[PDB]
């Protein structure tokens, strides 16, 4: 009977001393077992494993609490999905493009590249320590844990088509957006005026128009009575807003916005590019960089900087 000492963990901070029998698999001893994303469930302990840290599933009460405190989930499959993703994302390249961490194209990750690029241009603090820790490493160029977490939080596998608006929506649920406030006003000529106050995630996202200006002036929407009503922004308190719409030809003017997502293709299949406004317009497509004075393209998402807005109307 040969034994080695290893450490189990769910958070890669708190370690649990285990003595493993080298005659049985990790699976027979701990259940599903991963070594930096690699599934070692059906492998037997090698000598070179002595003193290494394995991720295991939260199989007792201490690990359930460690896992919850670090990731803010009790989804039974979360760590499996994280590990499975990490195994791929640690193989991706993360070049610095114009001082932002991007991702070299692989495994249909264009929506993640534009998400990662967007997150480095907006004021956002994550609540789950997993996201805080991984984001800090992502800003510095080691984005593999962050990208695998986005996949695990969003319940996406590597290779699956993602939507940038849906992805941002999940990440925003795990961000401190409690100070964010939006007041809308809906004028129908029959039904009269109706104010609505939105907080948190619903205060920074809108689907229907790409234009922050048009949202301030009013957009037409159908009222329950059947008339077109005008919905306009009365008050905005957020460090950013995100305007989203189905992809349409739209002209981005330098200095009028922070960054945007371009989508070419259809519902089922397509590609994202990222446009950022700096000294001029840069298009980032994974590792690729071009610039222009003006940009026209099928835009789906535009991010604007904000502090406080109050309507004059």
Applying CB under 5 A, the residues found at the interface with Zn ion are 188, 190-191, 223, 225, 227
Residue 66 binds: one of Zn ion, Cl ion, none (C-beta under 5 to 8 A by kind): Cl ion
* CB of 198 vs Zn ion, minimal distance in Å: 20
Q: Which residues does 226 contact at the CB level (< 8 Å), separation at least 6?
A: none
Q: At 126, phi and psi to the nearest 5?
A: -90, 145
* CB of 222 vs Zn ion, minimal distance in Å: 9
Letters for 5-24 (x = contact with Cl ion by CB under 5 A, - = none) are ----xxx--x----------
Q: Which of 40, 58, 66, 229 binds Cl ion (CB under 5 A)?
A: 66
Distance from chain centroid for Cα 255:
25
- DSSP for 166-214, please give it: HHHHHHHHTB--TT-EEEEEEEETTTEEEEEEEEGGGGTEEES-S-HHH
> Between 37 and 200, whose beta carbon lies closer to Cl ion?
37
Copy the structure tokens of residue 85. Answer: 């993703």
> Between 221 and 225, whose beta carbon lies closer to Zn ion?
225
Does 56 bind Cl ion (CB under 5 A)? Our answer is no
Distance separating alpha carbons of residues 124 and 139, to the nearest angstrom: 13
Distance separating alpha carbons of residues 70 and 11, to the nearest angstrom: 6
Copy the structure tokens of residue 278. Answer: 């700096």
* CB of 191 vs Zn ion, minimal distance in Å: 3
Residue 191 binds: one of Cl ion, Zn ion, none (C-beta under 5 to 8 A by kind): Zn ion
Does 87 bind Cl ion (CB under 5 A)? Our answer is no
* CB of 76 vs Cl ion, minimal distance in Å: 16
Residue 133 binds: one of Zn ion, Cl ion, none (C-beta under 5 to 8 A by kind): none
Stretch that binds Cl ion, among 1-9, 86-94, 184-192, 212-220 (CB under 5 A): 1-9
Residue 87 binds: one of Cl ion, Zn ion, none (C-beta under 5 to 8 A by kind): none
3-state secondary structure of 241: strand
* CB of 63 vs Cl ion, minimal distance in Å: 6
> Between 83 and 223, whose beta carbon lies closer to Zn ion?
223
Residue 11 binds: one of Zn ion, Cl ion, none (C-beta under 5 to 8 A by kind): Cl ion
Stretch that binds Cl ion, among 66-74, 220-228, 258-266, 303-311 (CB under 5 A): 66-74
* CB of 156 vs Cl ion, minimal distance in Å: 25
Q: Which residues does 54 contact at the CB level (< 8 Å), separation at least 6?
A: 6, 7, 8, 9, 26, 30, 33, 34, 35, 40
Does 41 bind Cl ion (CB under 5 A)? Our answer is no
Distance separating alpha carbons of residues 127 and 124, to the nearest angstrom: 10
> Which long-range contacts does 272-277 make (Cβ < 8 Å, 24+ apart)?
272/110, 272/111, 272/113, 272/114, 272/164, 273/110, 273/114, 273/297, 274/102, 274/113, 274/114, 274/117, 274/118, 275/299, 276/98, 276/100, 276/117, 276/121, 277/252
> Where on the chain is the footprint of Cl ion (CB under 5 A)?
9-11, 14, 66
């Amino acid at each position: 009977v040969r034994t080695i000492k290893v450490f189990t963990t769910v958070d890669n901070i708190n370690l649990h001393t285990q003595v493993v029998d080298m005659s049985m698999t990790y699976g027979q001893q701990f259940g599903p077992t991963y070594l930096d994303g690699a599934d070692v469930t059906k492998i037997k302990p090698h000598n070179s494993h002595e003193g290494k840290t394995f991720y295991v599933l939260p199989n007792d009460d201490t690990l359930r609490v460690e896992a919850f405190e670090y990731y803010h989930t009790t989804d039974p499959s979360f760590l499996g999905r994280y590990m499975s993703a990490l195994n791929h994302t640690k193989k991706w390249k993360y070049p610095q493009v114009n001082g932002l961490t991007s991702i070299k194209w692989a495994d249909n990750n264009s929506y993640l590249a534009t998400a990662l690029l967007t997150l480095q241009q907006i004021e956002l603090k994550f609540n789950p320590p997993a996201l805080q820790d991984a984001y800090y490493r992502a800003r510095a160029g080691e984005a593999a844990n962050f990208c695998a977490l986005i996949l695990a939080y969003c319940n996406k596998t590597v290779g699956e088509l993602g939507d940038v608006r849906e992805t941002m929506s999940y990440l925003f649920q795990h961000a401190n957006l409690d100070s964010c406030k939006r007041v809308l006003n809906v004028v129908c000529k029959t039904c009269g005026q109706q104010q609505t106050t939105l907080k948190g995630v619903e205060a920074v996202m809108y689907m229907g128009t790409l234009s922050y200006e048009q949202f301030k002036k009013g957009v037409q929407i159908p009222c329950t009575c059947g008339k077109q009503a005008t919905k306009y922004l009365v008050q905005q308190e957020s460090p950013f807003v995100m305007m989203s719409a189905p992809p349409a030809q739209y002209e981005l003017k330098h200095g009028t916005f922070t960054c945007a997502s371009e989508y070419t293709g259809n519902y089922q299949c397509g590609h994202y590019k990222h446009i950022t406004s700096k000294e001029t317009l840069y298009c980032i497509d994974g590792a690729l960089l071009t610039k222009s004075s003006e940009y026209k393209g099928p835009i789906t998402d535009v991010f604007y900087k904000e502090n406080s807005y109050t309507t004059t109307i």
